[PDB]
Amino acid sequence: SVKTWRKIAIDIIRDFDHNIMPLFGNPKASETISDETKVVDKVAENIIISKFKDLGVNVVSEEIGRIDQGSDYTVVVDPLDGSYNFINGIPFFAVSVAIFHEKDPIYAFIYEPIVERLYEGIPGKGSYLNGEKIKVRELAEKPSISFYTKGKGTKIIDKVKRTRTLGAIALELAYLARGALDAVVDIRNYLRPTDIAAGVVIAREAGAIVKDLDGKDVEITFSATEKVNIIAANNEELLETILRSIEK
Amino acid sequence: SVKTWRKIAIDIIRDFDHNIMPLFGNPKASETISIETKVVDKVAENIIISKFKDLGVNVVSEEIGRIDQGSDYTVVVDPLDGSYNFINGIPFFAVSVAIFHEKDPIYAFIYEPIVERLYEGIPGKGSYLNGEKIKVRELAEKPSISFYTKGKGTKIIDKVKRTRTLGAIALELAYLARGALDAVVDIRNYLRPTDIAAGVVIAREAGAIVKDLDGKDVEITFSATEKVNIIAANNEELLETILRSIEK
Numbered sequence: 001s002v003k004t005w006r007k008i009a010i011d012i013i014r015d016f017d018h019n020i021m022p023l024f025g026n027p028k029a030s031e032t033i034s035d036e037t038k039v040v041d042k043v044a045e046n047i048i049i050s051k052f053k054d055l056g057v058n059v060v061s062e063e064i065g066r067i068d069q070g071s072d073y074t075v076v077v078d079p080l081d082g083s084y085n086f087i088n089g090i091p092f093f094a095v096s097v098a099i100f101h102e103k104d105p106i107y108a109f110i111y112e113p114i115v116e117r118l119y120e121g122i123p124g125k126g127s128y129l130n131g132e133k134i135k136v137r138e139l140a141e142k143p144s145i146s147f148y149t150k151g152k153g154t155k156i157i158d159k160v161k162r163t164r165t166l167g168a169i170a171l172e173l174a175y176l177a178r179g180a181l182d183a184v185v186d187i188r189n190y191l192r193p194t195d196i197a198a199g200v201v202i203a204r205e206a207g208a209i210v211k212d213l214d215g216k217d218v219e220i221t222f223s224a225t226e227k228v229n230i231i232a233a234n235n236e237e238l239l240e241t242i243l244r245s246i247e248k
Numbered sequence: 249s250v251k252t253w254r255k256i257a258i259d260i261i262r263d264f265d266h267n268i269m270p271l272f273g274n275p276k277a278s279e280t281i282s283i284e285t286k287v288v289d290k291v292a293e294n295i296i297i298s299k300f301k302d303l304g305v306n307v308v309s310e311e312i313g314r315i316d317q318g319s320d321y322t323v324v325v326d327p328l329d330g331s332y333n334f335i336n337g338i339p340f341f342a343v344s345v346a347i348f349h350e351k352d353p354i355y356a357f358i359y360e361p362i363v364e365r366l367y368e369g370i371p372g373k374g375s376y377l378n379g380e381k382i383k384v385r386e387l388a389e390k391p392s393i394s395f396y397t398k399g400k401g402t403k404i405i406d407k408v409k410r411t412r413t414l415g416a417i418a419l420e421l422a423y424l425a426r427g428a429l430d431a432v433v434d435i436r437n438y439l440r441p442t443d444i445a446a447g448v449v450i451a452r453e454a455g456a457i458v459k460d461l462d463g464k465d466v467e468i469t470f471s472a473t474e475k476v477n478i479i480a481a482n483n484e485e486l487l488e489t490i491l492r493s494i495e496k
Contacts, residue, residue, distance in 0.1 A: 084392065084410065088428040091339045091362050114339055114362060144332065147413075151402025158398075162332065165395075165413040166340075180336040 005099055006120065008051070009109045013118060015047045016095055020080070021113055025089025040087070044079030048095065052077060060194055060222045074100045076194045076222045081110075082168030096170035098197035098222070105220045108201035110174045119174040121202030129178050136207040136234035137179030143238060146172040148186040155245035156185065159238075173199025176232055177206035183233035187213065187246055192224040200232065208232050209239050213246060250370055253347050253355045256299070261359055261366065263295045264343055268328070269361060278335040285311065286335060292328035296343065300325070310442045310472045322348045322470055324445040330416030344418040346445035346468065353468070356449035358422045367422045369450030377426050384455040384482035385427030391486060394420035396434040403493035404433065407486075421447025424480055425454035431481035433490055435461065439476045441469050448480070456480050457487055461494070 003011075020043055023029035029040040041063055052059045058074040059067040075097060080086055082093030095111040108121040120128045127134050142161030147153070148169070157163065164181070166172055172184045173196065184203075200210050200220050210218045210232040218230055233239040268291060271277035277288040293311060300307050306322040307315040323345060328334065330341030339362040346356040356369040367382070369375045375382050390409035394417075395401060405411060412429065414420055417439060423429045425447075432451075445468045448458050458466045458480040466478055481487040 088392075088423070089363070089426075090412070090423065090428060115337065144336075149405070151400065151405055154400045162415070163413055164338070164415055165411055166338075167410070167412055175336075175338070178337075180338060 005107045006109075008055075009097070009111070009118065009120070012048055012051065012095060012097075013111050015051075016111065016113060019043055019047050024086060030087050038087075040080065040083075048077060048079040060224065062194075066224075072102055074222050076100070076197045078170065078195075078198075081170045082166075085167045090167065092166045092168050092171060094168055094171045094174070096198040098201055098220070100222055103221070105197065105201045108198040110170055110198055110202060112171055112174070119177065119202050121177075121198070121205045123201065123205055125205070127177050127202045127206035134178045134206055136176060136203070137182070139235040139238055140182050143182040145183040145185055145242075146175070146181055148188050148190075150188045150190075152187050152248065153185070153242075153246050156242055159241055159245060169195060170199040173203045173208075173232055176208055176234065177203045179234075182235065183231065183238060183242065185231050185242060187229045189227045189229055191228050191230070192226065193219075193221045193228060194224045196220075196228070196230060197222060200230075203232050208234060209236055211239060211243075213243065215240075215243060250355050250373075254357075254368070256303075257345070257357045257359070257366065257368070260296060260299065260343060260345070261361075263299070264292070264359065264361060267291055267295055272334060273337060286331065288334055289328055289331055292343070296325060296327045296345075306470070308442060308470045308472055310440050313472050314470060320350055322350075324348065324442055324468065324470065326418060326442050326446075329418040329443065330414075333415045338415065340414045340416045340419055342416055342418045342422070344443070344446040346449050348468075348470075353445075353449045356446040358418045358446050358450060360419055360422065365422075367425065367450055369425075369446070369453045371449065371453055373453075375425055375450045375454040377422075382426040382454055384424060384451070385430070387430055387483040387486060391430035392428075393431040393433055394423070394429055396436050396438070398436050398438075400495040403495055404490060407489055407493060417443050418447045421451045421456075421480060424456055424482065425451040427482075430483065431479070431486060431490060433479050435477045435479075435494060437475045437477055439478065440472055441474055441476060442472050444468070444476065444478060448478075451480055456482055457484055459487060459491075461491075463488075463491055 057071045060076045078096040081096045086093040091114045099107040110119040147163040305319040308324045326344040334341045343359040358367040395411040
């Protein structure tokens, strides 16, 4: 039979649990197998990256670059977002995938193994967590945000009750999508569109407002030729206040 | 003896998994009881505080203050570090307990339930994770640190490869202790001795240097109101560099 993208995600989930989870915080994971290629990297390729390649779709990933198969579909995949955390036994990491039909995102999923959570984003339908529809939470009286910066945004701190910097942006955007945070802010001028594609698909379909520092809605793409900054939030006024609180 | 305290740690692990973990993912856990104290905070407090109170030892906890029972032993505890995280499904929370024979620390443990990890610190013997000896890692690359500040952090951020702000200082100190981070910096004038007692004992025995804003070794006092700032690291030069880079 023909497997839908969700079934493909389920297969990837199971393969990740069986082949990659045993390497969590394991010295073997960082061991060079062949830039020094880690064991975890090779395993991620042979099980996740290889899967999409075999499907015949174009593939965009950090470790392999960009694979052009002349397909009408392109998959942006991070076999292990939160790699530093994973290698160091910090329980915050995930598999993140965004699927595009030509230039349009049609599906995205983020799998958070530690707590067995499968987040899904389907443009035009909705976002889900383990099959249950999710949406951003109503703005908290005392907001909580994920915050990434190289120094800018000090004025943001007094606007919120607390900040988090967990180490896996795609997953933090998924947290925003299910209501665990009010905003996710990254003004390091370090991210590429590919790093946020899946997270933005899921957060946006969950009701999040995602804009750049100019207040322009973020366009979801599989490009990696430019650096981007974003503010994803569950409330326009909060987003604007954060925006007015950032220099340059 | 240290042996008997370790038995108590296990009773606590069991009590925690039975009374607290079923609340992870359960909306009931987030209900605000009093003023914000939530259900999970109170349940965590009930099981652990009663445990030590019934043993007849002195107890220091943020919400209860200091219970003086004229004992020769004092326990400085945080029943549940990472409350916000817990109620929002963020996998960063722990139980923190430091045991003092009078003014001297003889045992401390931090329980990180999500990954079934028991960190123990035994001054004069060593620090352990699930019974295996742990130690701070050697600084061999641009540092990875936990960082909390209310002001500008540009200068400190420039000195590091990455930062983490997890929302559970006990875990961040435990991570430093086993080599998952190079430093933990919290200069918010927000932490209490109860938040850091166990982490300091464990990190120190593991080889970490833990100082305050004045560059002096941090002294754990039996107070639940005293505000403390910490700069803990696996390298003296890095610690000094951090101090020189502190901004308002």
